[PDB]
Scaffold this motif. Structure first.
Motif, PDB file in Angstrom:
ATOM      1  N   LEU A 284       0.834  -1.217   0.000  1.00 21.80           N
ATOM      2  CA  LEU A 284       0.000   0.000   0.000  1.00 21.80           C
ATOM      3  C   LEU A 284       0.858   1.253   0.000  1.00 21.80           C
ATOM      4  CD1 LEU A 284      -2.685  -0.982   2.526  1.00 21.80           C
ATOM      5  CD2 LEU A 284      -2.928  -0.792   0.024  1.00 21.80           C
ATOM      6  N   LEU A 285       1.818   1.178   0.919  1.00 23.75           N
ATOM      7  CA  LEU A 285       2.785   2.241   1.182  1.00 23.75           C
ATOM      8  C   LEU A 285       3.689   2.425  -0.010  1.00 23.75           C
ATOM      9  CD1 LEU A 285       1.795   2.093   4.087  1.00 23.75           C
ATOM     10  CD2 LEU A 285       3.969   1.186   4.721  1.00 23.75           C
ATOM     11  N   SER A 286       3.544   1.565  -1.043  1.00 21.54           N
ATOM     12  CA  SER A 286       4.278   1.764  -2.321  1.00 21.54           C
ATOM     13  C   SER A 286       3.494   2.618  -3.326  1.00 21.54           C
ATOM     14  CB  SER A 286       4.704   0.448  -2.997  1.00 21.54           C
ATOM     15  OG  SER A 286       5.122  -0.547  -2.061  1.00 21.54           O
ATOM     16  N   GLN A 287       2.259   2.219  -3.555  1.00 25.86           N
ATOM     17  CA  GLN A 287       1.334   2.830  -4.553  1.00 25.86           C
ATOM     18  C   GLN A 287       0.992   4.204  -4.091  1.00 25.86           C
ATOM     19  OE1 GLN A 287       0.604   1.017  -7.411  1.00 25.86           O
ATOM     20  NE2 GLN A 287       2.357   0.261  -6.200  1.00 25.86           N
ATOM     21  N   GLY A 288       1.604   4.432  -2.932  1.00 28.02           N
ATOM     22  CA  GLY A 288       1.440   5.530  -1.978  1.00 28.02           C
ATOM     23  C   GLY A 288       0.063   5.515  -1.389  1.00 28.02           C
TER      24      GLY A 288
END
Ligand SMILES: Cc1ncc(C[n+]2csc(CCOP(=O)(O)OP(=O)(O)O)c2C)c(N)n1
Ligand SMILES: Cc1ncc(C[n+]2csc(CCOP(=O)(O)OP(=O)(O)O)c2C)c(N)n1
Ligand SMILES: [Cl-]
Ligand SMILES: [Cl-]
Ligand SMILES: [K+]
Ligand SMILES: [K+]
Ligand SMILES: [K+]
Ligand SMILES: [K+]
Ligand SMILES: [Mn+2]
Ligand SMILES: [Mn+2]
Lengths: 374, 332, 374, 332
Positions: free
Chosen positions: C297-301
């Motif tokens: 999640l913290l990637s796709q922001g």
């Protein structure tokens, strides 16, 4: 890379379902062709003449007894019968590969194992007639054989129940440092029972010296194998339990022997189970193994038509001597319906025994007491 | 909560089972113990320490398959070795019902005594436990009572459990020994450290009395003991309290001798009424003691429902239910 | 060449046992690594943000409820509990790949399936407390959930019994031209039961649209998989029944989703069973899927610490509002222990109901009647 | 050998079962029939013609696995479809005992009626057959009678079988219907071609009488009918003959109303005495009719042994055994 306790495997980064190989299944091991010829010389067990003739005489004597007892059932002289036709090679080939004291759990159609182990014709007959010579005391349906002397556990009607039992007996043999194997026979229909899944898995996880011998004759009563399973028969299930498995031509006594001999050697050395699936044709309840082996004998020059005629006569005479004796023996005393329920008859069961004896004193004319003992 | 043999120690009922099993594996080198999760000591601790003492080949886990456990145990016993199988809860014995009823019970009979599985014992936790609901509370003895060739035994206490379990292990017939699980950690009592036996098929009169006979087994014996006390105190009624101990073959003579004396009988069990084993005791006592019966034989049992979670206090045949039935019987 | 009905295969002229491949087993399908990174772009399902956040909020809400109800059991406020730790990804990833009306048969640890299907917290609580809001009427042990509205068949304690039942429901769905699948969950220990062999074989021979979903967490209570089986876990058993099989990383919500989505599509189109074995770690009765998905999640922001803090607060508040309500509801009327044994209470059962009511009139002071309804 | 509904034809009991099943699959499009060897018509011919008439998707063979047959049937019924499972001999129902007792019987209760398997019927051949020995002769009804949530039904004739089987198929509870196999090809009688129902949990008084009540079910009803005739002829005793029909839930009222009138009761069944269902009838009648009983209630049952091959004529509770017990009871 993956660290999961339940399996040893790598990761894969593409979705791929594993497909069953059913159309090109596990191949069928063969040693001799339909003309009795050895196909691959390195596989020939080169069994000695006296042993190969014992294989052939055991199968043919079983066939002679089957014809007589099948006619006896059609006449109502015994209440039930079921022949061994098409299974003589599997029964006899595998029994010849065992040690005499290896314990057998059967499935149904094991009479050839007892025949190879020299079970008297009188005793096959006694069980079918339920007469006083039956050590089973006349309590089971015909064609429910057992022999403690010949390490052949009494057969019971419920399918597959003997499979996890055979595994327990094999675990006990391992602890006893027996250097004994257990063999367990079952059909391809019986392999659908939950008890087969139990036995197969227990034998592998508890490391038991057992041969599972499945006879796949294509049918379970009216049910063809297309309605029984959709994998590659029973042999393809063994590897999923961690069991070494093989498929053999059940009409080839030498292929059955070689596979059973090698499974026995390895099961006893390694304490691991082996699965043999023997493919046959259901020929017969109330391309043949004998023909193939006869062709072989007639090669080594080991048999001929004169010997065949003499043995056919001699075997018929022996079967008929036993049949006569069996029919003229009485049935056991009706008191025997109460013993062996427990090792000792409970007093309340003795009371029921006594009540039958009183009953027969008053009403005995109404009971078929003339050919019961005492 | 609804309820001369040498050196002893206080043991609860789980400890008494471990002591029986330890004594058995010490004196019988063939004996093995197996089932689900028995190696680490079991979910009720009945096999603690045994694998370390006797070896992994003798106390071991099976796969999770009850039909397999019982079939496997039969096979061990066919070779003459003692097989002590565990079924984790009696509610889960039913996958093995065919192996018990069609195979173990009939093994000796059907072979003319050429083969047997007498050296099998199946032990299983049994009975209610306060909150076990449908599948951790059952008391299945009446299903087994209708199967000739097995014995079914249920103790009421630690001393009784060890002596009855050693008798089952050594009895030459397949035995089911049901251990009342609500007693596993309840009050200890003094239990001999060395082996001893209590006979099978023998009831025990634990309190003599003259006006009414009360019969039960397992934990329900403690309920009827209390009922005897209520009846004495509240009604001046003298109750003879009997622990049946063996469900089959059961001690008909002890029960009938009591009822011939008292003239009244109340039988109580946690299992449901219909088809429960009180039905067999009642119908047999009636036949043998008909002329002595002053009032109908009373059965105070679980209702004919599955065993509920939140309603357990209302389901069980507790001391009030038994006492009220007894009062009606005395007044009949 | 061989003409045996039971198998399709060639002859072989050398004796060769078939060996199991256990050390290099069926590989474990993965989509994202432990850092939440997609490993192979062609495998990414590219689920939309709202659906991926529903996966994450369902798993974390289940974890929040587990912590509260596990403490409730430790205090004796409910009689039993068992958490979902380590199984959130399997529960939630697979449920997201089903259609809402696909029927679920569970095994034990399925609460995340109900959570994904928006089962109210009040109703999880009502079943654990056995209160008047439980549609199960307080009759089963806690953590025995069921919901007719959400097509989730009530769970029962006996292991594996639901496996052949799920197969029957799938056969009935096929006849109804449902265009519905059935999914059946079970653990690797439960797969040793005879009912699993029954269900696996029936689904293949009767051609049923069913997904068998095995959660392999390495242990069955105290029993490691080395004592449970000796083949290559459960996935290697599928092909022996003719069942298409796959093994997946159960800590990877996207691998679970992709495999379940594809099994569902093919099971419903082809009327054939599929087996998925999801490997996990048994983390908890009375490298984590959530962490991995949070990393994604913290990637796709798509998430951050502020959102995480707010959701942790909001989820705790919702769980505690439901917990309060559940504890303050009464239990159902004790008359409800007699209904639904049969659809209609037999007169003899009504007589027992009436006898309890009389009993409570006289002896009610002795019963914990204060928080039972009526 | 030891023993107004429109157009009828003579049918034996196998034919009457086929007629019930045909009527069911005609009027209920959800209904399916399955088990071992049912597609070709079954080993007792009960399903002949049905697959050709109704289709391979509706009358079909399963693998050889009884636990699977019953679990599968439960699952069909969970979706609301009628599931008519066959177990080839009642002796082989025990692998399915866990699915019947722990699952089918408890399905509705444990879910609060959110799910059920009411549309399941299990049918199975039952009872002795002259030479079936241990595993083709059993009569297992008492094992099922102790399980709340299932119904168990046993007919005595072709007309009774079709009407009771249609009632089981349509009853909203899982039902076991045991078909006495020794009657399958015995005498025909007139059976309606179109559907009709006989109620469950209702006994039938087939002969009124005033001195003694005789209760049985299945083939044993014909034995007690004959016993009534012997008693009338030999002793001048008038017997009331009752077919119980439903084992559970059973018709307590009809049996007790008879015994209050006659004052005597004899119950007979092929199953073994101990734990058999006569035990439940006897103990209930005693409770309800105590003051009316002139003599102890008599149970004439199979012995407490497995069912033997060569000894079957001596094992069964035949008309002489029943008559001798009746004579003793009259003379008590
Ligand atoms: C538990 C059980 N169910 C059903 C039967 C009835 N039955 C006797 S033989 C048979 C078919 C067995 O088929 P298979 O195992 O292939 O053996 P085969 O007869 O072909 O040797 C069946 C269903 C039984 N004896 N036991
Ligand atoms: C028939 C039966 N036997 C035993 C049990 C007791 N039991 C409850 S959970 C469990 C272990 C199940 O292991 P697995 O299937 O791997 O599930 P997991 O708990 O790992 O999810 C056991 C033995 C049961 N519920 N049912
Ligand atoms: Cl001895
Ligand atoms: Cl309805
Ligand atoms: K058997
Ligand atoms: K014993
Ligand atoms: K279940
Ligand atoms: K029904
Ligand atoms: Mn076959
Ligand atoms: Mn597990």
């Amino acid at each position: 890379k993956p660290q999961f306790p339940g399996a040893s495997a790598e990761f894969i980064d593409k979705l791929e379902f594993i497909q069953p190989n059913v159309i090109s299944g596990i191949p069928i091991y063969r040693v001799m062709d339909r003309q009795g010829q050895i196909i691959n010389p390195s596989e020939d067990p080169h069994l000695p003449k006296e042993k190969v003739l014992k294989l052939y005489k055991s199968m043919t004597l079983l066939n002679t007894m089957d014809r007589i007892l099948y006619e006896s059932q059609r006449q109502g002289r015994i209440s039930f019968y079921m022949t061994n036709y098409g299974e003589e090679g599997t029964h006899v080939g595998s029994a010849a590969a065992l040690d005499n004291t290896d314990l057998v759990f059967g499935q149904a159609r094991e009479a050839g194992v007892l025949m190879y182990r020299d079970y008297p014709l009188e005793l096959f007959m006694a069980q079918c007639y339920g007469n006083i010579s039956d050590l089973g005391k006349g309590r089971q349906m015909p064609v429910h054989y057992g022999c403690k002397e010949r390490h052949f556990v009494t057969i019971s009607s419920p399918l597959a129940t003997q499979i996890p039992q055979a595994v327990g007996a094999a675990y006990a043999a391992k602890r006893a440092n027996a250097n004994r194997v257990v063999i367990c026979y079952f059909g391809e229909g019986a392999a659908s029972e939950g008890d087969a899944h139990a036995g197969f898995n227990f034998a592998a996880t508890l490391e038991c010296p057992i041969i599972f011998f499945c006879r796949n004759n294509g049918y379970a009563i009216s049910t063809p194998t297309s309605e029984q399973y959709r994998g590659d028969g029973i042999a393809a299930r063994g590897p999923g339990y961690g069991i070494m498995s093989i498929r053999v031509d059940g009409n080839d006594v030498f292929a059955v022997y070689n596979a059973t001999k090698e499974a026995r050697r390895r099961a006893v050395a390694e304490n691991q189970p082996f699965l043999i699936e023997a493919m046959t044709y259901r020929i017969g309840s109330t391309d043949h193994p004998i023909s193939r082996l006869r062709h072989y004998l007639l090669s080594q020059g080991w048999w001929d038509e004169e010997q065949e005629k003499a043995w056919r006569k001699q075997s018929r005479r022996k079967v008929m001597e036993a049949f006569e004796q069996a029919e003229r023996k009485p049935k056991p005393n009706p008191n025997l319906l109460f013993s062996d329920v427990y090792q000792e008859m409970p007093a309340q069961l003795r009371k029921q025994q006594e009540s039958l004896a009183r009953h027969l004193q008053t009403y005995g004319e109404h009971y078929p007491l003339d050919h019961f003992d005492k | 909560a609804h309820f001369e043999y040498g050196q002893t120690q206080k043991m609860n009922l789980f400890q008494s089972v471990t002591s029986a099993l330890d004594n058995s594996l010490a004196k019988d080198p063939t004996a093995v113990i197996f089932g689900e999760d028995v190696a680490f000591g079991g979910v009720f601790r009945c096999t603690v320490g045994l694998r370390d003492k006797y070896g992994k080949d003798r106390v071991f886990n099976t796969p999770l398959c009850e039909q397999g456990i019982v079939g496997f145990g039969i096979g061990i016993a066919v070779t003459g070795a003692t097989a002590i199988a565990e079924i984790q809860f009696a509610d889960y014995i039913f996958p093995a019902f065919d192996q018990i009823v069609n195979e173990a019970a009939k093994y000796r009979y059907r072979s003319g005594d050429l083969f047997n599985c007498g050296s099998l014992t199946i032990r299983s936790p049994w009975g209610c436990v306060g909150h076990g609901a449908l599948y951790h509370s059952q008391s299945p003895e009446a299903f087994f009572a209708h199967c000739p060739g097995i014995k079914v035994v249920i103790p009421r206490s630690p001393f009784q459990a060890k002596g009855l379990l050693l008798s089952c292990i050594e009895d030459k017939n397949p035995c089911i020994f049901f251990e009342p699980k609500i007693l596993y950690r309840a009050a200890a009592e003094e239990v001999p450290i060395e082996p001893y036996n209590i006979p099978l098929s023998q009831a025990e009169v634990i309190q003599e009395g003259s006006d009414v006979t009360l019969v039960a087994w397992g934990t329900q014996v403690h309920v009827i003991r209390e009922v005897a006390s209520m009846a004495k105190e509240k009604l001046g009624v003298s109750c003879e309290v009997i622990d049946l101990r063996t469900i089959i073959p059961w001690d008909v003579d002890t029960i009938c001798k009591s009822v011939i004396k008292t003239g009244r009988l109340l039988i109580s069990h946690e299992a449901p009424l219909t088809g429960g084993f009180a039905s067999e005791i009642s119908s047999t006592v009636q036949e043998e003691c008909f002329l002595n019966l002053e009032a109908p034989i009373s059965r105070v049992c679980g209702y004919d429902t599955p065993f509920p979670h939140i309603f357990e206090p209302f389901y069980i045949p507790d001391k009030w239910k038994c006492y009220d039935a007894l009062r009606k019987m005395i007044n009949y």
